[PDB]
């Protein structure tokens, strides 16, 4: 009676497989997929409520446009309109802005919860169609430091290990990851390894105590940002105790020293930016020797590091010894504590240094493993390259050979792709406020809630009368409330999808149900809108003169009906499932997109299997070469790209070697002071996803954790005259929010620090945070700034 | 018009009064925990839940005693040890908005 079909979980980058039961157009149940290798049948509480996430009573079903006196008005209340009406106004607004200001004044803010084909369609629309690089995603707030860290150390993105490392590690080292709540099924694999093989050690480092400490053998609370000094201490330890894997280092690594004093990614007239010496080229580095590297880290001794970090020397040593001991297989894990960090690219480099010095990489259990947060920050944002500097498969717009290769695959005139990186996430809000980004489309994110410094940048940027803001969502959100046009979107299994998880596993799903009302997928909206633009309106004449076959053609024709993206006909669609977009445009759009996109990575290290293979499997891990997935990269015998006889080949780098970097501790952008004497850390809880727009509309998840709270040390509550349950304002120099004190909760911070989760749309903690970023990756540090706490 | 019930009526620029912390209610999806769990130890030294729910309160089902290969073991699987990844208590308060889910439970 039920029809059960496979899909990845809609939520975290773990990428659990689920099976989904449908009857009469409704998801009636889901279950953890017992045949999926990632989770073998388990989910967490979020996964187990997937059957409720599409059914909030206020699901968007019609376009809503601000209207006054019968026409679009910025000051108008939202009124329902047709799809043609919505797209007419969008078309007017985009064309007006393009003629007056050009493509640097249009933009898109996308998502690592886009399906792979959504992100690819949006990248073509902006980079090849509008000729704008102002497309960037919420994964900018997330994995940008990790991807910069990979490109610097390895020359290619994403982990070289895989989830199988959890069954082989002898020591897990969590560098601020709260896996117990944020990658629950991976933490179950940690817990299984540890309880079943009890010589295994679990080391948890954090700026506050949380549920991971319930398993930890060694728990380390450290001062925000002083992880940089701890990582160097370990490197020094390995060297001073003669535990370098010298053959590995000589064969497979080189050494660089990075430029320092690189500022904090603030507006250029901010005093911190003016103060910095090297903000202009903050990723520069020079070649050095091993010995210069050993000298550099020798400054990071126990006296300096233990005082700076507040971690006792005995613990720094227990930790350093697991890294050093050649017989211990070490899996290091990190998430936003390393990446949302004003030196988080360096921290990424620095944890790879520990593994490179010892040769503990790319083999089972010996695994520096960057955890990804969103379900498709990897499969979509990073691999498709939906970022202001990117092209697909690690390519960059600044490289002329990369632009040539995109223009070849996309059948564009030479010189079509813009060569200068466009506006990244943080800069998009600053340019909106400054009225320089005037037509803007947000899809599958809630960036008004999610971006730091809401009151100074994002809210006045969205409400600026010079700008026109379109938001595609499934539900009302504060982002949609700040927009001018809201488009009702089809979500999760209302559309055929692909998501790529933290271990390079791309997982497909069919469309299993039909969206309510006139909700339509983000994919449909992008490709439909592209019909509204002729090449003569969006391309300089000299490009049309080089491909004159395109005269008078629309972007829909150039980008989507190009002989490639439309080469698979309706008869290729599996007739047992709907496919709304295929029916809408007249060909198998997802398959054509995927196969054209897959041309970028095939034979270049990022190989995706044939489209149909993913509808048959429970994911496959890239590179998929001759039908076989790859579990360990860069290791001979595991990765088909590695030359025989080399042992290891980091073939992202021209000499095949990984880079070890000498980089210092530098302090946060904003630390506590006399006026604002507490650290504010922000983040998540197990039961809610991100902005809460999905989870906090599920009755059981709302009731499990109805409101955000200020987690506070009991001695700090006593010093402030507070008790559990009293209301406070949390206040920074930027803004304020009101919430209740929790001195007895699952997060127990040290004195001087509070933790506030960001899932509650009535408690917008991103009014308080600072949009300072790592200057290399442009990723915001939401994990530390200075606040005071005042009674209401 | 357009309202976000997860925020309530307050414009983005303003700051709503926070509700009280709600007490926890006393009284196939993982069942919710129909009792308070404040102060219950759940760590590698002691699993308070197993104190009443061991197959030795309604006991855990045999699935909870299964490893990754579906071998039934003589004690709770490490994979199920941290109960609160899947089972959650509930505040004694109504949902913010309706939800049109259906459980299979009630449609076969
Ligand atoms: N339940 C749930 N899970 C999710 C999500 C969700 O919304 N809910 N979202 C997913 C996404 S996209 C992401 S990015 C991840 C986030 O996963 P995490 O990064 O694990 O979780 P957060 O709660 O964002 O961050 C809290 C951690 O930041 C660490 N931290 C703070 N400052 C520092 C520092 O200076 N150094 C280091 N090293 N650590 C620091 C603290 O130690 C704390 O453990 O979760 C993913 N999984
Ligand atoms: N203070 C603070 N801020 C943070 C973080 C932090 O740790 N602290 N974490 C940062 C990080 S790592 C990340 S990943 C971001 C996450 O921030 P966002 O991605 O902005 O947050 P989400 O709530 O996941 O937004 C997803 C949106 O997609 C909508 N929706 C669901 N399905 C669909 C669909 O198929 N189509 C469309 N159009 N809409 C859909 C949902 O209703 C929701 O509004 O937050 C960043 N912001
Ligand atoms: C005895 C002092 C208990 C402790 C310790 C824990 N639980 Fe419990 N639980 C207890 C009773 C008497 C009942 C009601 C009878 C029943 O089985 O429902 C429960 C109920 C649950 C449930 C609901 C099971 C169902 O509805 O099918 C769950 C999921 C549950 N309890 C979980 C749970 C957890 C995770 C605990 C540690 C934090 C825990 N219980 C401790 C008695 C007692
Ligand atoms: C997810 C990986 C879970 C973990 C960890 C724990 N439980 Fe569970 N439990 C889970 C599900 C999906 C279900 C329903 C289906 C099933 O396998 O039975 C349950 C059920 C229970 C029950 C009810 C048993 C019954 O006969 O109906 C109880 C009392 C219960 N679970 C308790 C419990 C305890 C104490 C756990 C920690 C040791 C625990 N569960 C972990 C999913 C998950
Ligand atoms: S661990 Fe992540 S992927 Fe798995 S069920 Fe929970 S939210 Fe989904
Ligand atoms: Mo957080 S991707
Ligand atoms: Cl607020």
- The tokens for A313 are 């020397």
CA separation for the pair A188, A210 (Å, rounded): 16
Angle at A208 (CA atoms; ends A207, A211), nearest 5 degrees: 130
Angle at A285 (CA atoms; ends A283, A288), nearest 5 degrees: 155
CA separation for the pair A343, A347 (Å, rounded): 6
Note whether A216 and A324 are same-domain residues: yes
- CA-closest candidate to residue A785, choices A759, A764, A765: A765
Ligand 4 centre to CA of A592 (Å) is 43
Instruction: Tell me which DSSP letter residue A218 carries.
Output: E
- The tokens for A773 are 């970023």
A46 is catalytic: yes
For chain B, the domain total comes to 1
Query: What residue numbers bound the domain in which B12 lies?
Result: 1-108
Interface contact A738-B95, CB threshold 8 A: no
What is residue A755's three-state secondary structure? Answer: strand
Q: Which of A574, A607, A630 is the last residue of a domain?
A: A630
Burial (CB < 10 A; 0-12, 13-18, 19+), residue B61, is exposed
Which residue precedes each gap in chain B (C to N above 2.5 Å)? 27, 56
CA separation for the pair A418, A397 (Å, rounded): 7
Q: With a 6 A CB cut-off, is A211 part of the ligand 1 pocket?
A: no
Element (H, E) at A528: helix A522-530
Work out the number of other CB atoms within 10 angstroms of the CB of residue B11: 12
Query: Which ligand ends up closest to the CA of B81?
Result: 4
CA separation for the pair A505, A545 (Å, rounded): 42
CA separation for the pair B21, A741 (Å, rounded): 9
CA separation for the pair B47, A399 (Å, rounded): 56
Note whether A559 and A419 are same-domain residues: yes
Tell me the CA distances in angstroms from A451 to A109, A255, A444, A470, A786, one per residue in order: 11, 35, 14, 17, 17
Residue that the structure tokens 């940048």 belong to? A457
Query: What residue numbers bound the domain in which A504 lies?
Result: 1-58+492-515+588-630
Burial (CB < 10 A; 0-12, 13-18, 19+), residue B57, is exposed
CA separation for the pair A179, A255 (Å, rounded): 32
What is residue B42's three-state secondary structure? Answer: strand
All residues at 6 or more sequence positions from A484 whose CB lies less than 8 Å from its CB, including other chains: A65, A66, A72, A74, A468, A469, A470
Q: With a 6 A CB cut-off, is A142 part of the ligand 1 pocket?
A: yes
Q: Which of A535, A567, A587 is the last residue of a domain?
A: A587
Instruction: Tell me which DSSP letter residue A40 carries.
Output: T
Work out the number of other CB atoms within 10 angstroms of the CB of residue A583: 11
Residues A190 and A202 sit within 8 Å (Cβ to Cβ): yes
Instruction: Tell me which DSSP letter residue A112 carries.
Output: T
Note whether A782 and A704 are same-domain residues: yes
Strands A727-731 and A736-742: antiparallel
Strands A253-258 and A658-662: parallel
- The tokens for A443 are 């899809």
Cβ contacts of A702 on chain B, cutoff 8 Å? 95-96
Note whether A76 and A215 are same-domain residues: no
- The tokens for A290 are 């091993």
- The tokens for A685 are 């809880």
Burial (CB < 10 A; 0-12, 13-18, 19+), residue A105, is buried
Residues A782 and A449 sit within 8 Å (Cβ to Cβ): no
The CB-side HSE value for A591 (13 A sphere, CA atoms) comes to 21
Q: With a 6 A CB cut-off, is A335 part of the ligand 1 pocket?
A: yes
3-class SS letters over A534-572: EHHHHCCHHHHHHCHHHCCCEHHHHHHCCCCCCCCCHHH
Can you state the angle between helices A589-601 and A116-123, rounded to 10 degrees? 80
Q: Which residues pair with A78 in a beta bridge?
A: A66
Kindly write down the DSSP assignment for every residue of A441-485, as one continuous string: EEES--HHHHSS-TTTTHHHHHH-TT-EEEEEESS--HHHHTSSE
- The tokens for A162 are 């895989």
Cα torsion for A579, A584, A585, A590, to the nearest 10°? -20
Burial (CB < 10 A; 0-12, 13-18, 19+), residue A29, is buried
- The tokens for B103 are 């459980």
Element (H, E) at A28: strand A26-32
- CA-closest candidate to residue A562, choices A129, A146, A213: A129
Question: For chain B, how far is it from start to end, CA to CA, in angstroms?
Answer: 39
- The tokens for A195 are 């309880």
Work out the number of other CB atoms within 10 angstroms of the CB of residue A192: 19
Work out the number of other CB atoms within 10 angstroms of the CB of residue A690: 19
Largest CA distance in chain A: 78
- CA-closest candidate to residue A603, choices A632, A623, A619: A623
CA separation for the pair A593, A121 (Å, rounded): 7
* Residue A245's CATH number: 3.40.228.10
Tell me the CA distances in angstroms from B84 to A502, A503, A770, A777, B48, one per residue in order: 24, 25, 33, 35, 12
Residues A521 and A443 sit within 8 Å (Cβ to Cβ): no
Residues A107 and A422 sit within 8 Å (Cβ to Cβ): yes
Work out the number of other CB atoms within 10 angstroms of the CB of residue A237: 24
- The tokens for A56 are 């909030």
Note whether A131 and A149 are same-domain residues: no
Cβ contacts of A703 on chain B, cutoff 8 Å? 25, 32, 90-91, 93, 95
CA separation for the pair B16, B74 (Å, rounded): 52
Note whether A309 and A343 are same-domain residues: yes
Residues A133 and A422 sit within 8 Å (Cβ to Cβ): yes
Cβ contacts of A194 on chain B, cutoff 8 Å? 78
Strands A71-72 and A64-68: antiparallel
A25 CB within 8 Å of a chain B CB: no
Residues A498 and B21 sit within 8 Å (Cβ to Cβ): no
CA A418, A423, A428, A434 torsion-angle sign:
negative
All residues at 6 or more sequence positions from A84 whose CB lies less than 8 Å from its CB, including other chains: none
CA separation for the pair A728, A742 (Å, rounded): 11
Tell me the CA distances in angstroms from A560 to A395, A494, A532, one per residue in order: 21, 22, 13
Edge-to-edge strands of the sheet including A17-23? Answer: A3-8, A17-23, A26-32
CA separation for the pair A684, A706 (Å, rounded): 13
Kindly write down the DSSP assignment for every residue of A594-662, as one continuous string: HHHHHHHHTTTT-PPPPHHHHHHSS-EESP-BTTB--SSSSBTTT-TTSPTT-SB--TTSTTS-EEEEE
For chain A, the domain total comes to 4
CA separation for the pair B91, B24 (Å, rounded): 4
Burial (CB < 10 A; 0-12, 13-18, 19+), residue A77, is exposed
CA separation for the pair A709, A694 (Å, rounded): 19
- The tokens for B15 are 């700051």
Tell me the CA distances in angstroms from A353 to A2, A333, A341, one per residue in order: 52, 14, 18
CA separation for the pair A133, A308 (Å, rounded): 41
Q: With a 6 A CB cut-off, is A766 part of the ligand 2 pocket?
A: yes
Nearest chain A residue (CA) to B69: A40
- The tokens for A39 are 């989770």
Cα torsion for B90, B92, B98, B99, to the nearest 10°? 20
Q: Which residues pair with A258 in a beta bridge?
A: A285
Instruction: Tell me which DSSP letter residue B11 carries.
Output: -
A374 is catalytic: yes
Q: Which of A601, A630, A659 is the last residue of a domain?
A: A630
Atom 28 of ligand 4, nearest CA residue: B60
Tell me the CA distances in angstroms from B44 to A15, A43, A219, A699, B66, one per residue in order: 26, 21, 13, 31, 19
CA A171, A172, A176, A181 torsion-angle sign:
negative
Residue that the structure tokens 């008790």 belong to? A723
Q: State the smallest CA–CA distance between residue B106 and chain A in angstroms.
A: 10
CA separation for the pair A357, A523 (Å, rounded): 45
Note whether A193 and A63 are same-domain residues: no
Cα torsion for A58, A60, A65, A70, to the nearest 10°? -70
Angle at A476 (CA atoms; ends A336, A697), nearest 5 degrees: 70
Instruction: Tell me which DSSP letter residue B17 carries.
Output: P
Q: Which residues pair with B42 in a beta bridge?
A: B47
Q: With a 6 A CB cut-off, is A225 part of the ligand 1 pocket?
A: yes
Instruction: Tell me which DSSP letter residue A130 carries.
Output: I
Element (H, E) at A591: helix A589-601
Residues A683 and A757 sit within 8 Å (Cβ to Cβ): yes
All residues at 6 or more sequence positions from B63 whose CB lies less than 8 Å from its CB, including other chains: none
CA separation for the pair A78, A73 (Å, rounded): 9
Note whether A323 and A451 are same-domain residues: no
3-class SS letters over A349-398: HHHHHHHHHHCCCCECCEEEEECCCCCCHHHHHHHHHCCCCECCCCCECC
Note whether A261 and A303 are same-domain residues: yes
CA separation for the pair A413, B99 (Å, rounded): 50
CA separation for the pair A234, A223 (Å, rounded): 17
Resolution (Å units):
1.7
Query: Which ligand ends up closest to the CA of B60?
Result: 4
Note whether A504 and A602 are same-domain residues: yes
Note whether A407 and A429 are same-domain residues: yes
What is residue B95's three-state secondary structure? Answer: coil
Instruction: Tell me which DSSP letter residue A748 carries.
Output: B
CA separation for the pair A689, A450 (Å, rounded): 12
CA separation for the pair A135, A113 (Å, rounded): 15
What is residue A419's three-state secondary structure? Answer: coil
* Out of A45, A692, A709, closest to residue B30 by CB: A45
Q: Give me the helices (H) in A32-74, please.
A: 45-48
Tell me the CA distances in angstroms from A552 to A512, A527, A534, A545, A673, one per residue in order: 38, 18, 6, 12, 62
The CB-side HSE value for A705 (13 A sphere, CA atoms) comes to 26
Tell me the CA distances in angstroms from A692 to A377, A687, A701, B4, one per residue in order: 18, 9, 10, 11
Instruction: Tell me which DSSP letter residue A313 carries.
Output: H
Residues making up the binding site of B: 35, 49, 52-53, 64, 83, 86-87
- The tokens for A34 are 């017992």
A336 is catalytic: yes
Note whether A399 and A304 are same-domain residues: no
CA separation for the pair A327, A359 (Å, rounded): 11
């Amino acid at each position: 009676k039920l029809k059960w079909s496979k899909a990845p979980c809609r939520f975290c980058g773990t990428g659990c497989g689920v099976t989904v039961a449908v009857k009469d157009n409704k998801v009636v149940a889901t279950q953890g997929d017992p045949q999926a290798e990632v989770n073998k049948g388990l989910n967490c509480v979020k996964g187990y409520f997937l059957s409720k996430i599409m059914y909030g009573q206020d699901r968007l079903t019609r376009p809503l446009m601000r209207m006054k006196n019968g026409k679009y008005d910025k000051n108008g209340d939202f009124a329902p309109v047709t799809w043609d009406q919505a797209f007419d106004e969008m078309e007017r607004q985009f064309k007006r802005v393009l003629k007056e200001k050009g493509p640097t004044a249009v933009g898109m803010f996308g998502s690592g919860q886009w399906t792979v084909w959504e992100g690819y369609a949006a990248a073509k629309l902006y980079k090849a169609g509008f000729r704008s690089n102002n497309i960037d995603p919420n994964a900018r707030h997330c994995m940008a430091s990790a991807a910069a860290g990979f490109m610097r150390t390895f020359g290619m993105d994403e982990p070289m290990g895989c989830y199988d490392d959890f069954e082989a590690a002898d020591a897990f080292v969590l560098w601020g990851s709260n896996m117990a709540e944020m990658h629950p099924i991976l933490w179950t694999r940690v817990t299984d390894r540890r309880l079943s093989h009890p010589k295994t050690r679990v080391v948890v480092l954090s700026t506050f105590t949380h549920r991971c400490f319930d398993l930890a053998d060694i728990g380390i609370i450290f001062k925000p940002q002083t992880d940089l000094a701890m990582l160097n201490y370990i490197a020094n330890y390995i060297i001073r105790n003669n535990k370098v894997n010298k053959d590995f280092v000589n064969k497979h690594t080189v050494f660089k020293e990075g430029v320092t004093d690189i500022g904090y990614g603030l507006r250029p007239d901010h005093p911190l930016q003016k103060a910095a010496k090297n903000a202009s080229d903050p990723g520069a580095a020079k070649v050095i020797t091993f010995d210069e590297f050993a000298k550099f880290v020798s400054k990071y001794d126990a006296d300096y590091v233990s005082k700076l970090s507040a971690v006792p020397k005995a613990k720094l040593d227990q930790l350093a010894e697991l890294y050093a001991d050649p017989n211990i297989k070490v899996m290091s894990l990190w998430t936003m504590g390393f990446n949302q960090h004003t030196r988080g690219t360096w921290a990424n480099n620095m944890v790879y240094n520990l593994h490179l010095l010892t040769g503990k990489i790319a083999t089972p259990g010996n695994s520096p493993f960057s955890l990804t947060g969103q379900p498709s920050a990897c499969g979509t944002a990073r691999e498709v390259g939906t970022f202001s500097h990117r092209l697909p498969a690690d390519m960059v717009v600044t490289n002329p050979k990369h632009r040539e290769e995109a223009e070849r695959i996309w059948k564009l005139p030479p010189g079509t792709i813009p060569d200068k990186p466009g506006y990244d996430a943080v800069l998009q809000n600053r340019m909106l406020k400054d009225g320089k980004l005037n037509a803007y489309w947000v899809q599958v994110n809630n960036n008004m809630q999610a971006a730091a410094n809401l009151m100074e940048e994002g809210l006045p940027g969205y409400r600026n009368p010079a700008n026109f803001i379109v938001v595609s969502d499934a539900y009302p959100t504060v982002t949609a409330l700040a927009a001018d046009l809201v488009l009702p979107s089809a979500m999760w299994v209302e559309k055929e999808g692909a998501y790529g998880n933290a271990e390079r596993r791309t997982q497909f799903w069919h469309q299993l149900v039909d969206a309510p009302g006139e909700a339509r997928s983000d994919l449909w909206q992008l490709v439909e809108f592209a019909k509204r633009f002729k090449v003569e309106e969006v391309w300089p004449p000299e490009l049309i003169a080089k491909k004159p076959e395109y005269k008078g053609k629309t972007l829909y024709d150039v980008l989507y009906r190009n002989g490639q993206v439309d080469k698979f006909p309706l008869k290729d669609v599996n007739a047992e499932y709907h496919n709304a977009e295929a029916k809408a445009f007249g060909f198998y759009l997802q398959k054509g997109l995927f196969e054209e996109y897959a041309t970028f990575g095939r034979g270049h290290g990022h190989d995706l299997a044939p489209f149909d293979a993913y509808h048959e499997a429970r994911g496959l891990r890239w590179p998929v070469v001759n039908g076989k997935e790859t579990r360990w990269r860069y290791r001979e015998g595991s990765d088909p790209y590695v030359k025989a006889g080399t042992g290891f080949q980091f073939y992202g780098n021209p000499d095949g070697k990984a880079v070890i970097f000498a980089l210092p501790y530098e302090p946060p952008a904003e630390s506590p002071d006399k006026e604002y004497p507490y650290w504010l850390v922000t983040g998540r809880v197990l039961e809610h996803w991100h902005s809460g727009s999905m989870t906090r509309r599920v009755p059981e998840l709302y009731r499990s954790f109805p409101n955000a709270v200020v987690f506070m040390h009991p001695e700090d509550a006593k010093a402030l005259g507070l008790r559990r349950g009293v209301e406070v304002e949390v206040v920074s120099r930027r803004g304020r929010m009101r919430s209740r004190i929790e001195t007895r909760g699952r997060d127990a911070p040290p004195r001087g620090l509070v933790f506030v989760p960001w899932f509650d749309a009535s408690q917008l903690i991103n009014k308080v945070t600072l949009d300072a970023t790592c200057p290399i990756s442009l990723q915001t540090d939401f994990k530390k700034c200075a606040v005071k706490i005042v009674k209401v | 018009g357009l309202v976000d019930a997860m925020r309530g009526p307050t414009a983005i620029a303003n700051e709503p009064r926070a509700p009280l912390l709600y007490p926890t209610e006393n009284k196939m999806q993982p069942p919710t925990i129909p009792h308070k769990i404040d102060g219950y130890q759940l760590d590698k030294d002691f699993n308070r839940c197993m104190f009443c729910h061991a197959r030795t309160a309604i006991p855990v089902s045999i699935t909870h005693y299964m490893d990754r290969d579906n071998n039934v073991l003589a004690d709770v699987s490490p994979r199920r040890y941290f109960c609160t990844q899947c089972h959650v208590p509930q505040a004694d308060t109504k949902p913010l908005i309706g939800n049109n889910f259906v459980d299979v439970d009630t449609i076969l």
